[PDB]
Paper text:
The structure of apo-MGST2 (with two homo-trimers in the asymmetric unit) shows structural heterogeneity, while the structure of holo-MGST2, which contains GSH at only two of the three possible active sites appears more rigid. Specifically, the four-residue stretch (Ala101–Arg104) at the beginning of αH4, which forms part of the active site and contains the catalytically important Arg104, is uniformly observed in a 310 helical motif within the apo structure and the GSO3− complex. Notably, Asn55 on αH2 forms an intra-monomeric interaction with Arg90 on αH3 in the apo structure while it moves toward GSH in the holo structure. However, we observed significant structural differences in pore-lining residues between the apo and holo states: for instance, reorientation in the side chain of Val57 upon GSH binding broadens the cytoplasmic side of the cavity possibly increasing solvent access. In apo simulations on a membrane, the symmetry of inter-subunit interactions early breaks and the 310 helix at the active site unfolds in one unit at a time. Moreover, such unfolding is also reversible with some runs undergoing transient refolding. This local unfolding is not subunit-specific, occurring in a different monomer in each replica trajectory, and is accompanied by changes in inter-subunit contacts. In the apo state, 310 helix unfolding coupled with αH4 tilting is accompanied by further structural changes: loop L opens, Pro61 kink unfolds, the kink angle increases, and Trp-gate opens. These conformational changes widen the central pore, allow a significant water influx throughout the inner cavity, and expose the active site to solvent. In this state, the highly dynamic loop L, which protrudes to the solvent, can trap GSH and help approximate it to the binding site.
Microsomal glutathione S-transferase 2 (MGST2) is a member of a family of integral membrane proteins denoted MAPEG (Membrane Associated Proteins in Eicosanoid and Glutathione metabolism), which encompasses several important targets for development of anti-inflammatory and anti-cancer drugs interfering with prostaglandin and leukotriene biosynthesis. In non-hematopoietic cells, MGST2 catalyzes leukotriene C4 (LTC4) synthesis via conjugation of glutathione (GSH) and LTA4, a transient epoxide intermediate derived from 5-lipoxygenase metabolism of arachidonic acid. Previous studies of MGST2 have revealed that only one out of three active sites is used at a time, an intriguing catalytic behavior also observed for MGST1 and microsomal prostaglandin E synthase-1 (mPGES-1) both of which are strongly implicated in human pathophysiology. The overall structure is a homo-trimer, with each monomer containing 4 trans-membrane α-helices (αH1–αH4), forming three potential active sites at their interfaces.
Residue numbers in the entry:
A (entry chain A): 3 to 138
B (entry chain C): 3 to 135
C (entry chain B): 4 to 133
The structure:
């Protein structure tokens, strides 16, 4: 109820995650790289690696999104979440063309993660001072 | 039970994830791939990729599982969740044998993943529309 | 509440971010060009270590929260703190030599087992009570 926006952001992100993975499938077929190999076509390795970078940061994003969303402010976290989704959109397709074209998306994505993390830390400390240290 | 069914599926799924990760460790010994190398025996590389595929799809499953479970229907999401676990079981051992034999498990697993996402989306849309009420 | 779980989760997410970025630093020192993840054995250990931390992280998070909610938060939190340290050992251990990763790995996996156990017990317990 008080987390419906976070839920929505999470579901959209999961689609993008699902999407990226399926894109790795198409590259696999398009650049005749047969499983389980992930080397061969230079084209595939960029798509695969791009996708690999997105999965490792995904749980970080989800945790920091929700911590920020729950302990600081839901609307602001959501907005940031959406920019992260776009940053990752830029990152993924950028990488597929060339390694040089991934930087903006990546930098945008990590900047957003830093801020979510920051807000989450603040909201929790703020909440900690109420329940444990009685500064109600 | 509020989320006891969802919790239960998540613990079962996490255990399978642990199993998969540890099989790759066991695989290093049987096929003699010494760390940090991940190439050599075609057998290890299939086991490695399979587990790697399970890893990249795992957070998707959990999210869609809970969103579906929380906003649409817990029992139905839970049942779908169990099928996903089995699909991955089929996928994993299938891939281990040959890349060709992963497809039933893979298709089955992603089919549930598609379905979980939908119900979660619908249930959330349903919950959002209490902006009106 | 769940404030202790929240704090641990954020502390853990920070370490995950750290590991990921270390792989970037490794690319520079050992001159590995993207998208390649092979080359220097020095780089290859760091990459694998970070990659091993990635596959166990969601496992850790779920059992942490399941343990924290269905058994006991403080106890789960304490275990969580140990897991994070275990992973600190594993990573830096692996970077030095693959042989020196074992202590960190076994400790983190032991904690993962206990969190799993505690979580399973609380969920079984709550489910049977209906
Ligand atoms: C108390 C629960 C301990 C779980 C962690 C653990 O004991 O790790 C295994 C040990 O052998 C340390 O390597
Ligand atoms: C009681 C005190 C210690 C008992 C330790 C038993 C370990 C339980 C193992 C388990 O439940 O498996 C889960 C893990 O394998 C996942 O990493
Ligand atoms: C037969 C094999 C397993 C059935 C065990 C079901 C009961 C598990 C024990 C339990 O629920 O106790 C845990 C509580 O102490 C947590 O408060
Ligand atoms: Na996209
Ligand atoms: Na994962």
């Amino acid at each position: 109820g008080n987390s419906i926006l976070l839920a929505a952001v999470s579901i959209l992100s999961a689609c993008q995650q699902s999407y990226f993975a399926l894109q790795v499938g198409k590259a696999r077929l398009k650049y005749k790289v047969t499983p389980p190999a992930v080397t061969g076509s230079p084209e595939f390795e960029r798509v695969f690696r791009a996708q690999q970078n997105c999965v490792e940061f995904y749980p970080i994003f989800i945790i920091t999104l929700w911590m920020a969303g729950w302990y600081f402010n839901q609307v602001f976290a959501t907005c940031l979440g959406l920019v992260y989704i776009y940053g990752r959109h830029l990152y993924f397709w950028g990488y597929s063309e060339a390694a040089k074209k991934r930087i903006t998306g990546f930098r945008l994505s990590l900047g957003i993660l830093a801020l979510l993390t920051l807000l989450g830390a603040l909201g929790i400390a703020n909440s900690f001072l109420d329940e444990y240290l009685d500064l109600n």
